[PDB]
UniProtKB/Swiss-Prot annotation, chain A:
UniProt family annotation: Belongs to the herpesviridae major capsid protein family.
Cited function: Self-assembles to form an icosahedral capsid with a T=16 symmetry, about 200 nm in diameter, and consisting of 150 hexons and 12 pentons (total of 162 capsomers). Hexons form the edges and faces of the capsid and are each composed of six MCP molecules. In contrast, one penton is found at each of the 12 vertices. Eleven of the pentons are MCP pentamers, while the last vertex is occupied by the portal complex.
Subcellular location: Virion; Host nucleus
Record protein name field: Major capsid protein
Record note on quaternary structure: Homomultimer. Makes the hexons and eleven out of twelve pentons. Interacts with triplex proteins 1/TRX1 and 2/TRX2; adjacent capsomers are linked together in groups of three by triplexes, heterotrimeric complexes composed of one molecule of TRX1 and two molecules of TRX2. Interacts with scaffold protein; this interaction allows efficient MCP transport to the host nucleus. Interacts with capsid vertex component 2/CVC2. Interacts with the small capsomere-interacting protein/SCP.
First and last residue of the signal peptide: none
UniProtKB/Swiss-Prot annotation, chains B, D, E:
Protein name: Large structural phosphoprotein
Domain of life: Viruses
Similarity comment: Belongs to the herpesviridae large structural phosphoprotein family.
Section covered of the full-length record: 7 to 275 of 858
Record note on quaternary structure: Homotetramer. Interacts with the major capsid protein. 180 tegument protein pU11 tetramers bind to the virion capsid.
PTM field: Phosphorylated at multiple sites.
Cellular location(s): Virion tegument
Coiled-coil region(s): none
GN (gene name): U11
Curated annotation (Swiss-Prot), chain C:
Gene that this polypeptide is encoded by: SCP
Quaternary structure note: Interacts with the major capsid protein/MCP.
Family label: Belongs to the herpesviridae small capsomere-interacting protein family.
Organism in which the protein naturally occurs: Human herpesvirus 6B (strain Z29) (HHV-6 variant B)
Keywords (A to Z) from UniProt: Capsid protein, Host nucleus, Virion
Cell location: Virion; Host nucleus
GO cellular-component term (any): viral capsid
Main location class: virion
Biological process, per Gene Ontology: viral process
Recorded superkingdom: Viruses
Full protein name: Small capsomere-interacting protein
Length: 48, 269, 61, 269, 269
């Protein structure tokens, strides 16, 4: 969601900001994001 | 390892040397100096040059924006001293004891626009106050008053800030000679540091918008030439090179395009 | 000789794909990149999904 | 002329190149390179080696310790920025924003207390999270900056310093959108420089302690081997090589055995 | 004219160079420098050594104690400033205001007597009073003055002085601007100068007792080894080498053994 710097969005103790989140890459299809659909790491499209 | 196009061993070493020592030379503008862009070329006429040097300049502008975003120094370091002078001296003089003005007017002209002030009229109010403390009436010299031994040198400092916003120095106005003491030295440092802050921020925004405009410009001309062929490696290079870029995403895309330079050197026609 | 066993082991780990599918271009290009991984703790499922989405990207008529 | 007992000119070139590029090669630790010790072996097999590899390694450990103590870089240049960020910002934000001047950085006062840094870093995690958000909720981030794209880079840099404390580089911060404006210096960079500084000191004292322990062990073995012969220059060499060595004695003793090399090569059996 | 044993001119020039530039290099001790002790040794086997290097080490310790006793700087100049601070400031403030510790004023007046070794121990309480003057509600401050750079370089300077008693530097505590008060900065003056004075005297007395103990040891060895001979030159060298030595006696003994050198060299076999 928009303007996250007001709030504190969490899924672990880590807050999910622009910087904590790795951007989703739809073409290269990294293996790390495939591991982290099982794990608890949030991923964004950078479109906002 | 420092990815580039079909280049020689002299051009890669020279571009590595330039983008490493981007901080030491003055007038950092890549649009301004043409010794890099025209020379990062395969030669070979224009026929084999076009599509490959398009990718070469794409990597050059992209890595230029990367090293800018990595080598920016913090300007909040100078705005913290702006806040220290403006809060701790000038409010205590203008509102406390001497009180040559209104609490609301002076306090809110200092307090308003903590983030993103570009106002010259607030400065001009402090200039009129300082010159009223000074000898004369008019505002011919904005900054330091009573003395022009430092005026062209402070303008040289601001031009050097405009040239190299990555490496900047504070003038630190001289102690023994003064129009008056603590007050106009505080006002003087406040005006000079505010001008330095807005100068460095405008120069950074200029170079960031320039670099992003050049990268987005080269993406379209790259995609138009690469769109036509139908091999899998070709269309995968098309998708990798059509992934959208922002200045805050360019670092991750630089890592991605290294790991895809593993293939797309061979995917060129 | 030295690098072939890892590629084939990862090929059988991904799905148990047949060499006939190993000859496919999407496989022929990505098996070397899947070689420089999966030696880590990453996953086996991630590679299946990656092959899925890449094979899908390949086939856009 | 870096005198070595009985080696090939190739082996002398190997050991001279090792002690020359000690600061350049990674993983600076003499146990980590077996081919240095394997290069240190003497010709003609075990009958020659059982007497002469002891003296050869007794030269080589001393020279490793000598180039180790000579090529120490000063670690006050990195503590200077710790004190600068600490004293200038971490005091003054507390004094301004009413944190009653919690002195906790001043319990150490020095580079002498290599303990309590972890308690200071946990307190700084609480401070940085309180300044970034009002919620407080003490969280389990390693770094206040919330940067996960460069935390791997920071841990990479710390492992690079662990491998080569002789040659170190210092990382920095990026500013498109700042979590903390200028506070990011004295809470993020303070944690990074504190971890880097205590890492360099611990790895330094670890390597120096290992070098001194191996020098003492080679003293004991080589004296126990050379005890048997009662000849004149033999027990002269016993009295020369029986001298106890500190890290304060070691450079002068290198000069002693440099002088003694001409007589001792004949003197050994 | 500083004659010695059967050494070469290079080794004699090494000993003369060390004893001339003793004050220049750091950590002035023979157990710091085996290069003096092992440049002391004579060639041609160990029988020459067991007869003659005992005599030469005896000569080294005599002349080393001589150049110590000739080159000791007098520390009562800094004790004069200690007495000025203690007499002038502390007595006036404690007897004047908060006049309940007049017995501790008489205690530091007894500390003015030359018994400062026991007195520097548990001095801290009169820094504990200055805690309150430096900062209100006196919780705790470090073992030295409040300033971090000053405390670190005071510890550095004390280590430098303890290494080299012969060459010491005053720190020059003072500051133009002080959060601290002038009187508690004079307290910091007194604390640092007292530590420097007691450190220099204790390290001097340590090396002086080391030199005297080594001289007595080498006397016992020389007399026990030259006991066996019955010649007139032998018993004359026995008496000259048997005369007992205090530190006041060592200078006249050096002048006496200068004159007796020509007959005891012949008396040694």
């Amino acid at each position: 969601p928009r303007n996250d710097t007001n709030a504190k969005i969490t899924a672990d103790d880590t807050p999910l900001t622009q910087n904590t989140v790795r951007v989703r890459n739809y073409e290269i299809s990294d293996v790390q994001r495939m591991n982290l659909i099982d794990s608890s790491v949030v991923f964004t499209d950078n479109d906002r | 390892s420092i990815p580039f196009a079909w280049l020689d061993r002299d051009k890669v070493q020279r571009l590595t040397n330039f983008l490493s020592n981007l901080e030491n030379l003055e007038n950092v503008d890549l649009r301004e100096h043409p010794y890099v862009t025209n020379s990062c070329v395969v030669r070979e006429g224009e026929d084999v040059d076009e599509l490959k040097t398009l990718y070469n300049t794409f990597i050059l502008w992209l890595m230029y924006h990367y090293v800018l975003s990595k080598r920016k120094p913090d300007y909040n370091a100078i705005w913290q001293d702006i806040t220290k002078l403006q809060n701790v001296v000038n409010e205590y003089l203008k509102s406390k004891g001497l009180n040559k003005g209104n609490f609301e007017n002076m306090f809110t002209n200092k307090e308003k626009f903590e983030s993103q002030f570009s106002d010259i009229h607030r400065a001009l109010l402090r200039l009129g106050n300082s010159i009223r403390w000074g000898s004369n009436v008019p505002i011919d010299t904005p900054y330091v008053n009573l003395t022009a031994e430092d005026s062209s040198e402070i303008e040289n400092n601001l031009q050097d800030a405009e040239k190299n916003m990555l490496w900047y120095t504070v003038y630190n106005i001289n102690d023994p000679w003064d129009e008056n003491g603590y007050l106009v030295t505080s006002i003087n440092k406040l005006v000079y540091l505010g001008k330095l802050f807005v100068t460095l921020n405008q120069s950074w925004s200029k170079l960031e918008k320039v670099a992003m405009s050049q990268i987005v410009t080269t993406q379209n001309h790259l995609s138009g030439h690469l769109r036509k062929n139908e091999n899998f490696n070709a269309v995968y290079s098309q998708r990798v090179l059509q992934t959208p870029l922002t200045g805050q995403r360019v670092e991750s895309f630089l890592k991605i395009i290294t790991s895809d330079y593993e293939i797309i050197k061979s995917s060129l026609e | 000789k030295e690098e072939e066993k890892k590629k084939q082991q990862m090929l059988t780990g991904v799905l148990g794909l047949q060499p006939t599918m190993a000859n496919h271009p999407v496989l022929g290009v990505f098996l070397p990149k899947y070689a420089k991984q999966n030696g880590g703790n990453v996953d086996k499922t991630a590679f299946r999904l990656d092959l899925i989405r890449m094979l899908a990207l390949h086939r856009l008529n």
